[PDB]
Structures are given as structure tokens and as C-alpha cells.
Amino acid sequence: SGFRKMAFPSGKVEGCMVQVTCGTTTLNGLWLDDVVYCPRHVICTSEDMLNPNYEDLLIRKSNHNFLVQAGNVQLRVIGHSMQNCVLKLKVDTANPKTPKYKFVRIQPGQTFSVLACYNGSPSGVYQCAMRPNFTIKGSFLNGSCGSVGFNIDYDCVSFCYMHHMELPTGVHAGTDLEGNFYGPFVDRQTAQAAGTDTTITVNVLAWLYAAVINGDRWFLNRFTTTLNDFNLVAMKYNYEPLTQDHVDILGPLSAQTGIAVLDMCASLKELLQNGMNGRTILGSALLEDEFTPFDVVRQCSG
Amino acid sequence: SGFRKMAFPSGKVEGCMVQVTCGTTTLNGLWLDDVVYCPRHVICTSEDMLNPNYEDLLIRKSNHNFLVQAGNVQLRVIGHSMQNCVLKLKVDTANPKTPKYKFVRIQPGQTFSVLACYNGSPSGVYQCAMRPNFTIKGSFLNGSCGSVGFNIDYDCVSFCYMHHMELPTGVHAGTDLEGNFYGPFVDRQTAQAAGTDTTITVNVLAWLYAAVINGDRWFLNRFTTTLNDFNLVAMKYNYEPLTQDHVDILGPLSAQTGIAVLDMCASLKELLQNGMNGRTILGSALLEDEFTPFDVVRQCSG
Ligand SMILES: *CC(=O)N(c1ccc(-n2cccc2)cc1)[C@@H](C(=O)N[C@@H](C)c1ccccc1)c1cccnc1
Numbered sequence: 001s002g003f004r005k006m007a008f009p010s011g012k013v014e015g016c017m018v019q020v021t022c023g024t025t026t027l028n029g030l031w032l033d034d035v036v037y038c039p040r041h042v043i044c045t046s047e048d049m050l051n052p053n054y055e056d057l058l059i060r061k062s063n064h065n066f067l068v069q070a071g072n073v074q075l076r077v078i079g080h081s082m083q084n085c086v087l088k089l090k091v092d093t094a095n096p097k098t099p100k101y102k103f104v105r106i107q108p109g110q111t112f113s114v115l116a117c118y119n120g121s122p123s124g125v126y127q128c129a130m131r132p133n134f135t136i137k138g139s140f141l142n143g144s145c146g147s148v149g150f151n152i153d154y155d156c157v158s159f160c161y162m163h164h165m166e167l168p169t170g171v172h173a174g175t176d177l178e179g180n181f182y183g184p185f186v187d188r189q190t191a192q193a194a195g196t197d198t199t200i201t202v203n204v205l206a207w208l209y210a211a212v213i214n215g216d217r218w219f220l221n222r223f224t225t226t227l228n229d230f231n232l233v234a235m236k237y238n239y240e241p242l243t244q245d246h247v248d249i250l251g252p253l254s255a256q257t258g259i260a261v262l263d264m265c266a267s268l269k270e271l272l273q274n275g276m277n278g279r280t281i282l283g284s285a286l287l288e289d290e291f292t293p294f295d296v297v298r299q300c301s302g
Numbered sequence: 303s304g305f306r307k308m309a310f311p312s313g314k315v316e317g318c319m320v321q322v323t324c325g326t327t328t329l330n331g332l333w334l335d336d337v338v339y340c341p342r343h344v345i346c347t348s349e350d351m352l353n354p355n356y357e358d359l360l361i362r363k364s365n366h367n368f369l370v371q372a373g374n375v376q377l378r379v380i381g382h383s384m385q386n387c388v389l390k391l392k393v394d395t396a397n398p399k400t401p402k403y404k405f406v407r408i409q410p411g412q413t414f415s416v417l418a419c420y421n422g423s424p425s426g427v428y429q430c431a432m433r434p435n436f437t438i439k440g441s442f443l444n445g446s447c448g449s450v451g452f453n454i455d456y457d458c459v460s461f462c463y464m465h466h467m468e469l470p471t472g473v474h475a476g477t478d479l480e481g482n483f484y485g486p487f488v489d490r491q492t493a494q495a496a497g498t499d500t501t502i503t504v505n506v507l508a509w510l511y512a513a514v515i516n517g518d519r520w521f522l523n524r525f526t527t528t529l530n531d532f533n534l535v536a537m538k539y540n541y542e543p544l545t546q547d548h549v550d551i552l553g554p555l556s557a558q559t560g561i562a563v564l565d566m567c568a569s570l571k572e573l574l575q576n577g578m579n580g581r582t583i584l585g586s587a588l589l590e591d592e593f594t595p596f597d598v599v600r601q602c603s604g
């Protein structure tokens with residue numbers, strides 16, 4: 001029993017984290033095979049943040065302009081390029097600790113562990129979710145950039161996120177490892193606003209399903225409801241629409257709890273309309289939406 | 303900006319987690335140097351859980367009775383003993399991945415990362431705190447036992463917790479790595495109850511201090527208060543007494559925020575007496591007490 005925001009073990013990613021440098025600018029990179037990956041904003045100066053021309057800037061730099069440091073050691077940059085918003089710095093040496101990996105672009109609502117890195121040294125791990133507005137509510141400080149998000153597929157590390165910037169909202173924007181931003185965010189110092197953050201509906205139900213399995217069942221109502229009925233109420237409180245996929249994805253938890261999906265929805269509808277009256281579910285005084293059904297299955301099954 | 307329940311990177315502990323076996327009973331062990339450590343309850347059968355005599359039982363077993371498995375490999379047990387509630391199984395081979403380590407008995411209110419392990423395979427990481435009743439509100443399933451709690455001291459891993467059992471409360475009891483239980487719990491199948499769980503007061507203030515630093519400052523009142531005044535109100539809602547040590551330990555956050563300790567206390571007093579009115583602090587609808595001042599400094603400083 002018990003339910004916690006749980007991260008993947010970070011061991012196979014610790015061994016891939018390097019320090020990358022330009023002048024007064026050190027950030028984190030990710031050394032996989034004979035390539036090191038970091039945010040291309042490591043080439044910028046404080047003068048050229050308002051509107052930088054990254055192509056032009058990279059022209060000014062050469063292989064030897066970039067100080068890649070592995071713990072106490074240094075790597076020879078035998079070639080650089082730019083893939084969208086990432087520097088791919090080629091190196092003489094292949095990481096001997098390179099785990100099997102993939103690069104996946106994750107979908108909003110999906111979750112991943114973050115290994116928060118300063119000066120190429122892993123500092124800490126936490127679980128995070130792509131919000132529907134394509135921000136993340138991270139915990140990053142100055143120097144955090146190039147810190148990565150990942151899932152672990154049996155023995156295969158999937159990298160889904162690279163940290164690039166904090167918004168004035170105090171939330172976080174980043175790319176996949178092919179260097180495309182999640183959302184409309186750009187890597188320049190201009191006015192950018194995160195759109196309306198909406199609740200992830202399948203995740204909240206996942207979590208109610210976790211709650212039941214943990215014996216917290218008070219919120220369960222004698223009622224049920226319909227998709228359309230439920231999604232009319234949903235929209236009113238900034239919630240994602242529930243779909244038949246969403247329903248199907250909750251089958252294993254439906255199946256384990258004995259509780260139909262649509263009866264859980266009816267419980268949520270009453271919880272949305274009445275709030276929680278100071279009552280808590282799984283130690284929270286509000287509805288949690290940063291666990292998927294998989295996260296719930298993994299933690300509540302094995 | 304941002305504040306999350308953050309774990310230490312688990313890399314140096316992954317390499318110490320082994321599978322330990324007896325008949326129908328497999329749990330986790332911890333291989334440091336030429337010693338493997340696990341809960342001594344791996345020697346028990348379902349018949350001898352109500353009141354087991356561990357000495358007597360161990361008499362029945364020998365070195366070769368215990369199947370220690372490292373991933374795909376097997377270790378030769380060249381000697382066993384019992385230290386309080388842990389098996390120290392001596393092995394031919396020293397762990398080549400043994401990080402510098404210490405064994406510390408942690409104090410109630412202090413926090414540590416847990417590496418949740420099934421069948422000697424690390425499954426996930428989360429941050430946890432010793433509650434004042436000396437339970438932990440973990441996330442463990444069947445097979446979790448021998449999973450360890452640790453802090454990372456620069457490069458030195460400190461092991462503070464080994465998981466032994468779940469209470470009917472659905473909360474968790476375990477030992478230090480010398481095999482003494484945190485609290486009055488015993489490793490037998492008898493009626494055991496976790497006493498009154500009290501809130502960790504320094505931690506809540508730590509967290510309010512994190513909140514301020516993140517710009518969440520609404521709860522700040524025009525008032526202040528006294529220790530005695532504050533601790534009279536504290537006791538009423540099952541809260542730890544605040545001491546001058548507690549005050550001193552919050553100096554760095556006092557110092558960073560510009561806010562006196564005793565003015566933060568006055569804010570807490572009004573928050574305790576009035577609740578939060580549906581207002582949230584750092585994304586929580588209730589007062590969080592599983593971060594220490596150190597955790598707050600580490601995450602909000604670097
Ligand atoms: C790496 C880093 O920690 N941050 C950061 C600094 C500089 C830049 N940059 C873009 C173009 C040239 C240089 C990106 C990121 C800071 C940070 O992002 N601050 C925000 C307000 C910001 C500044 C400048 C441009 C864009 C954004 C940081 C702070 C906290 C968490 N992550 C990053």
C-alpha cells in the first residue's frame with residue numbers, strides 16, 4: 001500500500017551527464033555514443049539574448065571553442081552541428097556508460113522522471129508531466145539547462161525532454177532530443193506566456209483508482225453518469241475531454257477495483273461540483289493529475 | 303523557481319541491490335564490500351510468523367541455504383550472522399560498485415530517498431521522512447522488503463533505512479543497517495499500532511520559506527508572535543514543539559527571505575486556526591511537512 005510521486009532509478013542517466021562550456025556560460029550536456037547534446041543557447045552572450053541569430057553565431061565558433069568536461073576529464077570536439085534548438089557536438093570518445101536509448105517526443109499528459117543537473121553533476125530526481133499547455137512545473141535553478149527527462153523501458157532509457165528555460169510564470173519549457181520545443185516557446189529573451197493550464201482527466205481518474213486500491217473510498221457516490229454528461233461538467237472547470245481511448249486505458253484499474261469507469265466519473269463530477277470539504281484523498285487536499293494509468297498500474301501492481 | 307519532492311540520484315545504490323532467497327521467500331539485499339544485508343525475516347515460513355524464534359531458526363540454516371543473485375550471477379555465501387533484525391551474509395566477492403558509504407540512524411523529522419526494489423531490481427525512487435511515530439508513509443508492494451533509504455553526502459552514500467513490513471494502517475516500518483527498528487515495531491505477525499502521527503513543525507516552516515522564495519506570499523500576515531504563544535497553538539493541532547535549535551536551523555531561510563522566523567510562525571498560527579479557504583501554497587491545498595530546511599536550501603539555493 002502507499003502511493004507516492006515516484007521517479008525511475010536515474011543510474012543509467014547519471015553516466016551520460018557532462019559539463020559543456022562557452023566563456024561565462026556553462027550548462028549540462030548528454031553524452032550518448034560519440035555525440036554530446038545540449039541547448040544551442042550555450043553559444044549566446046547577454047547582449048544577443050533579445051533576438052539572437054544562432055546560425056550567424058555558430059559561424060563565429062569552431063570545434064575547439066567548446067569545453068566538454070566529464071567529471072575530472074575533457075573530451076576532444078571533433079565536429080559540431082545544430083539540430084533545431086540543440087547542439088550535437090561530435091567527440092573522439094564514445095561514452096562507455098551509454099545505455100541502450102531512444103529519443104521519443106512525448107504527448108501532453110504523459111509523465112517522465114527529470115534528473116536535475118548543475119555543472120554536469122546530477123543533483124536530484126523527480127517525476128514530472130507534460131502539461132496540456134506543453135509547459136512543465138519543474139524545479140530548476142540557474143545552471144539547470146540541458147538537464148533531461150526520461151522513461152526507462154525495461155533496460156532501454158527513453159529521453160523525452162531537455163530543459164531550456166523558465167517562463168515568467170515560474171514554469172519550464174524545453175525540447176525533445178531532436179531539439180524541437182514542446183509548445184510554441186522560442187529560445188530568446190522575449191515576452192512568452194503559457195496558455196490556460198487544463199487538468200489531465202484520465203490521470204485524475206487513474207489517481208482516484210489508486211485511492212480506492214489504497215482503501216481511501218469515501219468519495220465513491222451511489223451514482224453513475226455518461227461521457228457527454230461528464231465532459232459537459234469537465235469543460236466548465238478547465239478539464240481535458242474524456243475519450244473512449246481514455247476509458248479503454250483505465251480498463252486494467254476498472255478491472256482490478258471492480259468499479260466501472262463511468263461510476264468513477266460520477267464520483268469526480270460530485271467532487272468537482274462540491275469540492276472535498278477538507279477531506280483528503282491519498283494525503284492530498286486537491287485532485288492530483290500528474291500520474292498516468294501506467295504510473296498507477298506500475299506502483300499499485302508491481 | 304519550482305519546488306518538488308526531489309530524490310537523490312539513485313545510481314550509486316542501484317549497483318548495491320541483490321536478490322536474496324529462501325524456498326518460497328525472495329527479498330532484496332544490499333551488497334557492500336564482501337557483506338550482503340537483508341531483513342532476517344527471509345528465514346521464516348508462514349507457519350512461524352505469529353511468534354518466530356529467529357535464533358533457533360538460523361540454527362536450522364547453513365551458508366549454502368541462501369541464494370544471493372546479482373542480476374544474472376550468483377554469490378558464494380562464505381559465512382552468515384544475525385545483527386539484531388538483519389542478516390549479514392558474508393560472500394567470496396567484494397562489490398566492485400561499492401560506493402563510499404556510512405550507516406547512520408536518522409532522527410524523526412529527517413528525510414531520505416527510498417529506492418523501491420522488487421527481486422533485487424531497482425523499480426523506482428521517492429523522497430520520504432521518518433515520521434515522529436517512527437513510521438514512514440512509503441509506497442511498497444509485496445517483495446519490497448530489504449529496499450533501502452539513503453542520503454548522498456557529496457560522494458558518500460549514507461544508508462539510514464531498510465524496509466521490513468507494512469502496518470495495518472498501510473504505513474511502513476523498518477530498521478537502520480545495524481538492524482534496530484525505528485520505533486517499537488517487531489518483525490513478527492502480531493497486532494502493532496502506529497501511535498499519533500504529529501506534524502513536523504520546522505519542516506512546515508521550511509516549506510512556507512520555500513513558498514515565499516517561489517513568490518507564493520499571500521499567507522503572510524501583518525502579525526508576529528512568541529515561541530510559547532506559537533507552541534500553545536501548535537500542541538492543539540498535533541504539532542511538534544518548535545525549539546531554539548529549530549529557530550537557528552531556519553536562519554539561512556530567514557536570512558534569504560528577509561522574514562524573521564517568528565513572523566513565519568504567526569502566519570502558520572493563522573493558517574492553522576483559519577485553514578486555507580481553498581487557497582493553495584506551492585500547489586498543495588494542505589501544509590507540507592516532508593521537506594527539512596536543508597532540503598529547502600538544496601532545492602532553492604543549489
Ligand atoms: C540555463 C539557465 O538556467 N537559464 C537560462 C539562461 C539563459 C538562457 N538564454 C536564452 C538565450 C540566450 C541565453 C536560457 C536559460 C535560466 C533562465 O532560463 N532564465 C529565464 C528567465 C530566461 C532568461 C533568458 C532567456 C530566456 C529565459 C534558468 C533559470 C531557472 C530555470 N531554468 C533556467
Ligand SMILES: *CC(=O)N(c1ccc(-n2cccc2)cc1)[C@@H](C(=O)N[C@@H](C)c1ccccc1)c1cccnc1
Nearest residue numbers: 343346351442443444445446447466467468489490491
Ligand atoms: C517483504 C514483504 O513485502 N512483506 C512482508 C512479508 C512477510 C514478513 N514476515 C515477518 C515474519 C515472517 C515473515 C514481513 C514482511 C509484506 C508485509 O509486510 N505484510 C504485512 C501485513 C506483514 C505480514 C507478515 C508479518 C509482518 C507484516 C509487505 C507488503 C507491503 C509492503 N511491505 C511488505
